[model samples]
Target: TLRSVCVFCGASPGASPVYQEAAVALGRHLAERGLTLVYGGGAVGLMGTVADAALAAGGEVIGIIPQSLQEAEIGHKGLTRLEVVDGMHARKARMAELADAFIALPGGLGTLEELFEVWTWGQLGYHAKPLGLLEVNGFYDPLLTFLDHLVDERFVRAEHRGMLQRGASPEALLDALAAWTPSVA
Candidate 1:
């Protein structure tokens, strides 16, 4: 039962207007569903879109930012709760601690790193929370295909691949997450 979710997404807002719309839509949807949002503390990019939408919808937004980033003035100043950590590792850890589920939207290296680490933790039985990929506009098709390659090469087991849920829309993703229950073998 997740009352809150962690969102890992691109900080740049991306090149597509759709990406920004999707970010806002997801945030608003989560808020309407009475879910708190945990995300990277940034006032720019997709992170800002999510935070703004959630706040507009009267939802709580908890942001985790690195101390260095805060010092650089990269942190969102109007977040519901903002915690300045020492580095990326601590940021991820704090987000994980505040979330019961995780969702990864389109992003670059840093987002991929966070998503993979959280998924790896789930695989290691560290948590039974749901993991989801928001595949808006096939934004993650290449990544999924690459993961399929890993599956084909036996670098990843089928079960491990199956552990992740993907959806083309935020509503669909959340529905899947709400219905998911994991058990460690």
Candidate 2:
């Protein structure tokens, strides 16, 4: 729904082959969809995979890494541009601010934490600014169902619940997000 997107994923490149493939899939679509890809400034695993995926398509991609992470050498120099921040807090807030939309592609608590923090913000005020998940499979199925329980438990509202879109492929997900716009009222 916006010009830029921030993808939160793991450094593992994933033990699964598709976690490997999904990253590239996300990358190519982001470019074709005319959206810039943003993420943790890492060249590790799926991180490197997606960055190069978009880069190959000539899609604009940005990476934001804490100075610590960059110095540690996980940071990607190949991105459209790489931004280094002072710390983790800064990294999270900066990326969220830079990108208009948010998505979680795969792996780990860090990725989920990034998604939830943005989701929390959207719930408070920005509303349906379009955050979503790239349905990556059996794991994703459980995660969606878990969110369903979050709704069932009443901690999450239907209004905000609907805001977190999901689709099996990047095009479908991006299209759904793009199709939505805030109500004029």
Candidate 3:
């Protein structure tokens, strides 16, 4: 079981309150499971929701923000602890260092980049932790379909395609993630 999870999510506040809700639900569940939360250090949008919910639920939250962004005063000031890193690469590396698992909520470029990078690292045997995707409101269905296309085209193995835990419910996705452990064939 993972002692800490890295969550990648959008930093924008918009029509998808369901996405925000999923972030909070996951954070609360992590706290109840005695897991620490590692996330982008931001005070807005889904990022803020996760940090706030985890803190309120009595969970350990570790925020990693780029030094440049923090300098703009966008970092979450309410986190239990914060690390101001040199840049995006450094932030991602530090977050990965502190996490035992990864979960991606609905997001755009930055979130997708973060999720894919670690999963690729896992596939390359850099790590053996579980990677999850919370598909709340069918947000990730198209991406899942595209991945399926990759499998069909022989671009990726079926086993490699199974790396992602995809679903619309946060609780169910987390349960799936909890059951995953990569092993050499």
Candidate 4:
């Protein structure tokens, strides 16, 4: 059973207001579903928006941040639990260990890195957790297209490429994740 969801999102709200809106919606969805949120410990940008929304909805939130980014990210203080790790490696490891699933919202390089790392881990049989992309405002359409191209080019197997679920809305994404099963090799 999935109890916690790990969200990899922007430290900065993207170029559109829709990104922030989606973040709040996803947070609310998690709370309403009685699932805890696990994410980067940041009190700014979309990261802050999601965390704040979950808290407002009476949901538990666990934030994992590197000590180096504690001051830089403003390390959210309102979370149910805040874990300060020594560095990025430790931070990601802890978050992965805690969450039963992963989702990527609109974000920058760091967000992509985290999402890809977890997805790669899944591909390598490190975990059987579900992974998804909340394609808010069509932010991930191009990425999805490129992923398809990779499959067409034989760079990524169709089975592996299908591992990342994409949804245009928070409710749809969460619902899909809940019903997701590991793809057999």
- Estimate, for each residue in 1-185, the C-alpha lDDT of model 3 and write its tens digit: 77888999988754857877888888898898899999998988888888889899999999999989998898988788999989999999899999988999887898999998998888788887788888787788889889889989998876667778776766687787788754421
TM-score of model number 4: 0.95
TM-score per candidate? 0.94, 0.93, 0.93, 0.95
lDDT of 4 by residue, 86-128 (tens): 9999999999999998999899999999999998888888988
| Candidate 1 structure quality by residue, lDDT tens digits, 1-185 | 67999999998889889888989899999999999999998988888998999999999999999998899898998889999998988899889989989999888898899999999988888887778998879788988899999999999887777768899788989998888864531
Q: Write the per-residue lDDT of candidate 2 for residues 131-178, one digit (tens) a residue.
A: 889888776898888999998999998887877888878888888777
Ranking by lDDT: 4, 1, 3, 2
Candidate 4 runs further than 4 Å off: 183-185
Clashing residue pairs in candidate 4 (N, C-alpha, C atoms within 3 angstroms) = none
Instruction: Estimate candidate 1's RMSD in Å.
Output: 1.7
Clashing pairs in 1: none
The stretch of ten residues in a row with the least summed lDDT in candidate 4 is: 176-185
* Model 1 TM-score on a 0 to 1 scale: 0.94
Position 170, candidate 3: lDDT: 65
Off-target runs (Cα >4 Å) in candidate 2 are 126-128, 181-185
Q: With candidate 3 superimposed using the best TM-score fit, by how many Å does residue 6's alpha carbon deviate from the native?
A: 0.4
Model 3, position 162: C-alpha lDDT score: 73
Residue runs of model 1 more than 4 Å from their true location after superposition: 183-185
Best by the TM-score measure: 4
